[PDB]
Amino acid sequence: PFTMPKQTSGKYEKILQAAIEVISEKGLDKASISDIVKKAGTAQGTFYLYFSSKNALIPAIAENLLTHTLDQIKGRLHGDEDFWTVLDILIDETFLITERHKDIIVLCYSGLAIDHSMEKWETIYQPYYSWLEKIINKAIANHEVTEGINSKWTARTIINLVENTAERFYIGFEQDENVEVYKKEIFTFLKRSLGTA
C-alpha cells in the first residue's frame, strides 16, 4: 500500500514562517494573505492549499511555539537530572520564551478563541504534558517527589502555574518585584507541595 515519503516539503513551512514574520511586523489584521504569499515566494494558491484563512494559521503557529518551548527545555538537559533541576530549567525557559514571544502567545489566545477551538491547545500540549509526566514518575521512583500524586494531572498543573505566572509578569505587567523573585516563588510553591519529607 501507500507509505508516506519522508517528504520534508518546504512550501507549507515557507508559508507558515512567512505568515509568522508578516503578522509580527504589522499585526494579524493588517496582514494580507497577499503579503504573506509574496514574502514566501509563492502564489496565493499555495496559501489556500494549507490554510482556509488567516485564522486557520493560529493552531499551527501555536504548535510551533509549543515544540520550540519543549526543544529549548530539552536542549538544556542531559537526561539524568534530578526533578528540582528540571523544574528550575522549565521555569527559566518559560519566562524567557514568554518575555521574547509574548506577541505570539497573545495571538494564540485571540485566534484559537475567536474560532472556538481553545481545546486544540490542550491537544497541542500533549507531547509536553507526556514528557513532564514521565519525569515526574521518574522523580517519584527516586523519592524526590511524594508518592501517590497523580502525575498526569500534576504535569499539567505545573505547566499551567508556571505559564500563568510568566504571563502575569510579561503580559499582565504585574512586576512589583524583580522577575527572579517571581520564578523563585513558583519554585518554592511547587516544592512545598510536591517535595518529599
Place this chain on the structure above:
Amino acid sequence: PFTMPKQTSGKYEKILQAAIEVISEKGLDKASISDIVKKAGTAQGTFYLYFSSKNALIPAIAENLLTHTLDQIKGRLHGDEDFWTVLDILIDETFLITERHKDIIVLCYSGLAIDHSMEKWETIYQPYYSWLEKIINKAIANHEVTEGINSKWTARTIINLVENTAERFYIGFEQDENVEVYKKEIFTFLKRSLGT
C-alpha cells in the same frame, strides 16, 4: 463644586445586558449594534456613547463576570469561616461558573487579546485578588496557613490555578475523571503547599 450624582441603572446597563444577550444568540460577528441597540430599546447613538465598537464591550463584559464570581463566593460566606472552607467554596463556584458561562470566558480571551489589552484583565481582578489576600492574611494569623508566604502573590496564584483547572475541564475538555476528583485534586495540591 462637583460631586457625581449617586449611581443608578440607565442606558449603559441596558446596552451591556442587551449586548451580552445578543452575543449569546449568534456570537459576536453576527451581532450588530443595530441588533443590540434595538434589543435594548434605544438608538444606535446610545451604543456609541458608551462603546467605540463591539470589541470595546469585552472589558466591560469581563468585569461583570468577575463581579458575578466574587458575589457568588461571598454569597456563600458569613465571614468567620476557616481558610479551607473559603477555598472549597472558591473552587466549587469557579467550576460552576466556568461550566455555565464558558462562552463568556472564551469571548473575553478572544477580545481582550485582539486588542492587546490582556493586562486590563489583571486590573479587573484587583478586587478579587485583594479580597483573597485579606483572607490569607487572616488565615496566617490564625495559624491555618504557613507563615512567611507572600499573600498578594499567593492570592493570585491560587485563583490562577483553580480557574486553569476549571478551564481545562470545561473548555479544554480534559474530563478523564469525574469533575469532583479534579476539584479535590486542586484542593489537596494547595493544602499541601500552604498547609500548616
